[PDB]
């Protein structure tokens, strides 16, 4: 429940890849798998 409450959705040049700007603002490893892997992120 807690992780579902902190969820991001990015509709759709390399958004899926973990970015340096994401450090400390997005969890590095929590993401959906297969489809929309990295498109959806957890704060």
């Amino acid at each position: 429940t807690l992780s579902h409450l902190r969820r991001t959705n990015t509709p759709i040049a390399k958004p899926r890849q973990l970015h340096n700007t994401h450090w400390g603002l997005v969890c590095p490893a929590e993401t959906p798998e297969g489809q929309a892997c990295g498109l959806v992120k957890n704060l």
């Binding site: 992780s3 902190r6 400390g24 603002l25 490893a29 959906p32």
Partner: protein, 183 residues
Amino acid sequence: FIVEDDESLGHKELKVRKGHIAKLMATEYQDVEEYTWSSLLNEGLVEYIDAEEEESILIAMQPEDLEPAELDVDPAKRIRVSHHATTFTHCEIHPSMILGVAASIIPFPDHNQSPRNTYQSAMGKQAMGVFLTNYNVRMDTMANILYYPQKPLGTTRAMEYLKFRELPAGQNAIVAIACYSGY
């Protein structure tokens, strides 16, 4: 955390200080004059940083990196590069805060490879557990609740804020890594 020199041309120091930590711990113990996170922000001891603001600043992972450093070392400890950094605008509260709740559940994720951590962050969503205390009163469409939930033997310091110890979702099994009967 905000880092500025304690004296100009004195050692730069994290603005928070032990006495402030003691007041925070005293306020937390009452559960005097309250000392909150908002109190720290109004004191100017801590600051909120946007990514664009993050670009212009230089931050330090560990508060002990900041204090001045002028032999033998345990071989097991991880190799930490000396920071060699003159200026630090800020210091991170704790590196583990970069991790999410599911990653905070993961034990020793530094010692493990990242893809396995991702798989576990999904599987923890899938795993059973007591979601709420009022489940018996509530009528959800589907609910799975463990008979005898057991708090984890190895706990992250973030788990106390996660309330995972209070509301565990797994059992401390006795597991042997063995080849018995090939099953």
